[PDB]
Design a protein around this nucleic acid. Structure first.
Ligand SMILES: [Zn+2]
Ligand SMILES: [Zn+2]
Length: 56
DNA sequence: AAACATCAAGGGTCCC
DNA sequence: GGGACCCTTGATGTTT
């Protein structure tokens, strides 16, 4: 596949568009927000699993 | 105080 | 590249 290097930590990350996920570990930015409980996450899949709690 | 289940953070991998 | 799911590890709560 393809790999990327972190500009901050120099750790090798395997991901095409997965670098921003590792970037949001140092700065802790949360662009995704829940519609109901307003809980914020740094990853789209993490927001999806939170939505799974609302609808059983 | 081991054994055990649960949740989440972080990374790998596939598929569209 | 974004969406989606899985694998590994550590903190926390149960239970006996
Ligand atoms: Zn980094
Ligand atoms: Zn919610």
């Amino acid at each position: 596949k393809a790999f990327q290097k972190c500009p901050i930590c120099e750790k090798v990350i395997q991901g095409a568009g997965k670098l921003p996920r590792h970037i949001r570990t140092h700065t802790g930015e949360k662009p995704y927000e829940c519609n109901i409980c307003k809980v914020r996450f740094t990853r789209q899949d993490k927001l999806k699993v939170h939505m799974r709690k609302h609808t059983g």
